[PDB]
Write a protein that binds this ligand. Structure first.
Ligand SMILES: *[C@@H]1O[C@H](CO)[C@@H](O)[C@H](O)[C@@H]1O
Ligand SMILES: *[C@@H]1O[C@H](CO)[C@@H](O)[C@H](O)[C@@H]1O
Ligand SMILES: *[C@@H]1O[C@H](CO)[C@@H](O)[C@H](O)[C@@H]1O
Ligand SMILES: *[C@@H]1O[C@H](CO)[C@@H](O)[C@H](O)[C@@H]1O
Ligand SMILES: *[C@@H]1O[C@H](CO)[C@@H](O)[C@H](O)[C@@H]1O
Ligand SMILES: *[C@@H]1O[C@H](CO)[C@@H](O)[C@H](O)[C@@H]1O
Ligand SMILES: *[C@@H]1O[C@H](CO)[C@@H](O)[C@H](O)[C@@H]1O
Ligand SMILES: *[C@@H]1O[C@H](CO)[C@@H](O)[C@H](O)[C@@H]1O
Ligand SMILES: [Ca+2]
Ligand SMILES: [Ca+2]
Lengths: 165, 478, 504
């Protein structure tokens, strides 16, 4: 279990809308092997209470899916609990709300760092900043995984939506 | 009637054992002649002792035709030599192996049965704690037995690993050599009970040390409720013969002298338990205490039942809220009259977690909720190392000494239906605030005195008595 | 007041058994620990290492390769085939190449393991594996069900798919709670503990989350209550075990090889505890789903409602308007009134129809399709044809089969008594005692707290009479056993025979 700082006055309303997944910093089983298999991933965030409704749209087996999660209130502005074995702790670490965002997630005591953007090209200084941040998050330059830059799902399709909510 | 306080009494140090080549160590011990009861002064020193030693002469190699690991003396059948599996903790069974192909049985792809490691731990009944491993939770020894998971099908996403998939990786759980059987229980409508208590002590009663984290609220302005449930996710049975012991235990067990030495054997018991588990159930407990401000409750026009009811929906369970919601902060807590909530949750991957949530994870990370068990020494008869009769009589002998030496009955009397507690070499009392003496000074008491000493033989038969209404036998026969 | 566990004193030692080279003795339970008494955390048997000579006839050698750990006698045609036939370690060590380790990834039949484990029919629990359903006979019976490539074990004679049926709920009315034990009184053994013909495996017995069924329904004993019972059935597969020459589980094989010939209850007792008393020769795999409505007669007869009303109204939720409160005085069972409880019990496919849904929340929608899938992937043993364990002990696997079989027969008799909940002291408040091993725990009706369940919100609850254990037979002057209803007799309330006799 590990703890660092959320966005000062983190503002769910400013952070709302669509984000594009650019890179994951992690070491899970999956991301080393089936690495070459990352699908283009789009996050849709909307405020709901001190929680946050989060839709993720992506292909399974070449159909667009939509996963509906709930980034529930930790009681700390900026931290979010999510939940299969594990407990997901989300941290909004860094973000202008207009271009990029850096998220952390802890599960079964283990960190992962996510980088999102409103559009590509992302900036390189932003890529650097996130690289710099992972190499102090204690994961290696080989443990960064850059996701696709095209292939993003439009809308999921009523039959094909996961409703973890 | 303040009982006269007592000074602590330790025996003399026993004579040092001989030295021990395979670590260059001397040992000695002394015994708890008398613990300090009331304001008796502590006895500073410890009951075990040791010393660097170097009169060592040579340093278990016993493994006939079988393979043997480097510095564990675990005996392996030679076919587990280079088979794509660590059967020794040295790894020296998968070592030097260049040109060697290995079958998979598509089996090592899977996790061990949930709880395997907890189930292999020894257990100490005096303290109710877990000791170190007795069985090797992770030895498969060429077996590929598996337990099927009905749920493996559910589609799931996994934000940390950006993985969307049905879950082919928990279709089965591998069952280690030491487990005869392991079955999952379908989660059933496990009923969550609800009780309401006048005051801290009436609530303690039901149970009997968060009792400490609670003697902050005995102030009669505080009422209390609790949320309790128990859940079983699995039944399991340990193997009875050809048990493979944890290599650590194997070390200790070998490092034991065949000439009786109490201190050696007590140290062993201390490390590995008075008992080990032969079987039981996996699962957990979802338990909460609600601490409530009485006056503030009444002022909102509300009852304890009402607060339990809103609390339950912020968890999703079944049997004002203009700030309660989830009950996620001290401010929100307070608001709805709630001073504090205490988490007694055991099992599941301290704060607050929902029921639907805890119940989806418990299967995967349970505790041992129920269990049969047997004295540590009865495992020696049941191992691959075969006979060990000196070692076992020694260990039986010491267990009966140990289970007398450190029993809390030696803690005087504790009046007021007060609980006597032995800690280290000092006796205390946890009789909750209602009498005040060191032994606590209208409803009566009853409690058995310690078993006296074995009364020496009248026709190959000894007697052993006790007195104070205390329940059970007051006499036995050996 | 605690009751401490007590076992008898040690039986006279047996004389050394030649093959084991060992003597055995045992103790038997006189008194179970109860109400947090001191338990029995020591062994109920001992074994001593021996020395005699008396001749012992081993087995007819072994033709094939002998397994290193399990000591199974695999055929050489099974070495280096990518299977674990020594089931398990290695017919598969030291193989240059593998032959016919297939280009075809295979699943096992789903839940198959369960059908290979032995069953305690006295307690209804599943035990250690008796059958090795992960043993192919060198063969490869590929089997396709619902687009999956399955592999049939050598043991299984047949595992046929069943055409998906209908959520057709059957519906049974009942007036007295007494009349309601025709749903929950689910054994009846014919000589040699045999049972011909399929029967509902009442798994839930002294079992485990039949224990929340008993908590929930037993509170309705002062039966002002009337009961509607709903039940639907999904068969997904029929299973049939080979008539013979079966592949025993290697763990079971070795324990049976360990048993003495001199009759010693302790060793045979262990056997049944680990492996059960019967095994499965035929089965219907599938799923139940049952729910029962409990109705206050008076409050029902004041909304002017009838069983017919509800019975017939339940065919969806006599063609008039029921769905009034007969649906809301149901929906709001847990604030408003009239419906005492809706008790649900789901067997097979118990994933997430449970939580948020089936169990106490809503009754049942058209999420029966959903439950229908889930059963398919996690079926339950619903119906079963059984056989005593001793029918597995045959000459071709075992020296002395004859003796071991007789020994098991007699012990099964001793065992039945020893595992019965009648040795348990009474709980109060109408609670149900359950024996597990040597401990004994009370199942309490909702509205009752504390061990022995003596704390309650209701006064002088009619206590239902229960039996103590059958006495020993008076052996062969012509045998009869007696029984008293003393083990909780009714204090203000109210079965079976008190006397029974067997021809000798
Ligand atoms: C420990 O050993 C030393 C010397 O024998 C003394 O303090 C005393 O005997 C104690 O038992
Ligand atoms: C009698 O002794 C038993 C167990 O030794 C307990 O119930 C209690 O401590 C009482 O004094
Ligand atoms: C009776 O004796 C046993 C074992 O020595 C313990 O439970 C306790 O010391 C009691 O006096
Ligand atoms: C009973 O005797 C045993 C061992 O034979 C000891 O544990 C103890 O000293 C007691 O008098
Ligand atoms: C167990 O065996 C010991 C030794 O014979 C005796 O104390 C008694 O027979 C008990 O039942
Ligand atoms: C164990 O065996 C001894 C010696 O044969 C008997 O005398 C004893 O009573 C018990 O059966
Ligand atoms: C009657 O006896 C049989 C077995 O002896 C059991 O069903 C139970 O023990 C009951 O007392
Ligand atoms: C009556 O039942 C007892 C208990 O197993 C035996 O002595 C015998 O079976 C008898 O007929
Ligand atoms: Ca190996
Ligand atoms: Ca093979």
């Amino acid at each position: 279990i590990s703890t660092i700082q959320p966005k000062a006055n983190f503002d769910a309303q400013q952070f709302a809308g669509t984000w594009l997944l650019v890179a994951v910093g992690s070491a899970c089983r999956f991301l080393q092997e089936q690495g070459h298999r990352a699908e283009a991933t789009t996050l849709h965030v909307a405020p709901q209470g001190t929680a946050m409704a989060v839709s993720t749209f992506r292909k399974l087996d070449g159909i667009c899916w939509q996963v509906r999660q709930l980034y529930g209130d930790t009681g700390v502005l900026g931290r979010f609990l999510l939940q299969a074995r594990g407990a997901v702790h989300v941290v909004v670490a860094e973000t202008d709300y207009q271009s990029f965002a850096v998220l952390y997630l802890e599960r079964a005591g283990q960190l992962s760092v996510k980088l999102y953007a409103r559009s590509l090209p992302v900036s390189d200084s932003v890529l650097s900043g996130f690289e710099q941040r992972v190499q102090e998050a204690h994961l290696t330059e080989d443990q960064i995984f850059y996701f696709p830059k095209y292939g993003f799902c439009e809308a999921a399709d009523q039959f094909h939506v996961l409703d973890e909510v | 009637a303040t009982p006269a306080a007592v000074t602590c009494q330790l025996s003399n140090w026993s004579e040092w054992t001989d030295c021990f080549p395979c670590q260059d160590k001397k040992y000695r011990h002394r015994s708890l002649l008398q613990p300090n009861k009331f304001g008796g002064t502590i006895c500073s020193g410890d009951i075990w002792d040791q010393a660097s030693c170097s009169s060592s002469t040579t340093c278990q190699a016993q493994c006939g035709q079988d393979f043997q690991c480097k510095e564990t003396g675990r005996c392996l059948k030679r076919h587990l030599v280079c088979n794509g599996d660590q059967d020794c903790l040295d790894g020296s069974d998968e070592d030097d192996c260049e040109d060697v192909r290995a079958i998979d049985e598509d089996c090592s792809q899977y996790e061990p049965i949930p709880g395997s490691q907890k189930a292999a731990l020894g257990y100490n009944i005096l303290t109710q704690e877990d000791a170190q491993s007795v069985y090797d939770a992770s030895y498969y020894g060429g077996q590929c037995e598996t337990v099927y998971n009905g749920e493996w099908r559910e589609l799931r996403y996994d934000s940390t690993c950006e993985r969307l998939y049905y879950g082919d990786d928990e279709k089965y759980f591998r069952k280690p050599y030491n487990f005869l059987k392991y079955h999952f229980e379908a989660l059933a409508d496990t009923g969550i009970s609800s009780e309401f208590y006048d005051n801290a002590n009436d609530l303690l009663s039901k149970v009997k040390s968060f009792l400490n984290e609670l003697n902050k609220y005995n102030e009669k302005k505080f009422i209390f409720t609790r949320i309790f449930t128990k859940v079983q996710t699995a039944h399991f049975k340990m193997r009875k013969d050809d048990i493979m012991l944890d290599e650590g235990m194997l070390q200790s067990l070998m490092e034991l002298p065949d000439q009786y030495n109490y201190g050696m054997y007590a140290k062993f018991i201390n490390d590995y338990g008075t008992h080990y588990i032969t079987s039981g159930s996996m699962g957990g407990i979802y338990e909460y205490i609600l601490v409530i401000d009485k006056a503030k409750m009444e002022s909102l026009g509300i009852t304890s039942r009402d607060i339990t009811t809103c609390f339950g929906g912020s968890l999703g369970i079944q049997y004002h809220c203009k700030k309660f919601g989830g009950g996620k902060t001290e401010r929100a807590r307070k608001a709805m009259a709630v001073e504090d909530i205490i988490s007694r949750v055991r099992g599941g991957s301290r704060s607050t977690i929902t029921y639907r949530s805890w119940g989806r994870s418990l299967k995967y990370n349970p505790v041992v909720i129920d269990f049969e068990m047997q004295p540590i020494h009865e495992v020696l008869r049941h191992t691959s190392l075969g006979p060990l009769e000196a070692k076992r009589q020694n260990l039986r002998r010491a267990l009966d000494q140990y289970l007398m030496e450190f029993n809390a009955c030696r803690c005087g009397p504790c009046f007021n239906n007060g609980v006597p507690i032995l800690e280290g070499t000092s006796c205390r009392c946890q009789c909750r605030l209602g009498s005040l003496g060191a032994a606590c000074e209208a409803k009566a008491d009853g409690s058995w005195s310690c078993w006296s000493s074995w009364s020496v033989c009248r026709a190959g038969i000894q007697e052993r008595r006790r007195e104070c209404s205390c329940p059970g036998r007051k006499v036995q026969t050996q | 007041m605690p009751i401490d566990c007590e076992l008898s004193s040690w039986s006279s030692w047996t004389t050394c058994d030649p093959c084991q080279k060992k003597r055995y003795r045992y103790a038997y339970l006189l008194q179970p620990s109860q109400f947090h008494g001191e338990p029995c955390n020591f062994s109920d048997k001992e074994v001593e290492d021996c020395v005699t000579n008396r001749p012992c006839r081993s087995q007819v050698r072994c033709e094939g390769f002998v397994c290193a750990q399990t000591g199974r006698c695999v055929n050489r045609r099974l070495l280096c085939n990518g299977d674990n036939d020594c089931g398990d370690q290695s017919d598969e060590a030291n193989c240059r190449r593998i032959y016919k380790k297939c280009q075809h990834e295979m699943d096992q039949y789903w839940g198959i393991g369960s059908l290979a484990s032995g069953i305690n029919l006295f307690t209804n629990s599943f035990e250690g594996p008796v059958l090795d359903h992960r043993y192919y006979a060198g063969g490869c019976s590929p089997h396709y069900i619902l687009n999956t490539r399955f592999r049939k074990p050598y043991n299984v004679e047949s595992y046929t798919p069943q055409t998906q049926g209908k959520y057709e709920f059957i519906l049974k009315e009942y007036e007295s709670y007494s009349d309601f034990e025709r749903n929950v009184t689910e054994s009846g053994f014919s000589f040699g503990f045999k049972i011909p013909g399929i029967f509902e495996l009442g798994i839930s017995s002294q079992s485990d989350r039949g224990k929340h069924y008993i908590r929930r329904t037993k509170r309705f004993s002062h039966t002002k209550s009337v009961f509607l019972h709903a039940r639907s059935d999904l068969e997904v597969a029929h299973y049939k075990l080979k008539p013979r020459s079966l592949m025993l589980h290697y763990e079971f094989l070795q324990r049976v090889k360990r048993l003495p010939l001199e009759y010693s209850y302790g060793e045979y007792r262990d056997l049944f505890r680990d492996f059960g008393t019967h095994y499965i020769t035929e089965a219907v795999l599938g799923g139940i789903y049952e729910y029962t409505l409990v109705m206050n007669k008076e409050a029902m007869e004041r909304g002017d409602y009838t069983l017919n009303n509800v019975h017939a109204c339940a065919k969806n939720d006599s063609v008039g308007k029921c769905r009034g409160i007969l649906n809301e005085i149901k929906d709001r069972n847990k604030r408003d009134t009239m419906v005492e409880d809706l008790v649900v019990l789901v067997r097979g496919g118990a994933s997430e129809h449970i939580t948020t849904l089936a169990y106490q929340e809503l009754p049942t929608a058209d999420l029966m399709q959903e439950w229908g899938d889930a059963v398919q992937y996690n079926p339950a043993i619903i119906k079963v044809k059984v056989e005593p364990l001793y029918e597995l002990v045959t000459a071709t696997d075992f020296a002395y089969s004859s003796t071991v079989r007789q020994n098991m027969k007699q012990a099964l008799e001793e065992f039945q008594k020893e595992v019965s909940s009648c040795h348990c002291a009474p709980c109060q408040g109408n609670g149900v005692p359950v024996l597990k091993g040597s401990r004994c725990d009370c199942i309490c009706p909702v509205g009752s707290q504390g061990l022995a369940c003596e704390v309650s919100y209701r006064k002088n609850t009619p206590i239902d009479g229960k039996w103590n254990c059958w006495s020993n037979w008076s052996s062969c002057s012509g045998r009869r056993k007696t029984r008293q209803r003393q083990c909780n007799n009714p204090p203000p309330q109210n079965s079976g025979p008190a006397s029974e006799t067997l021809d000798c």
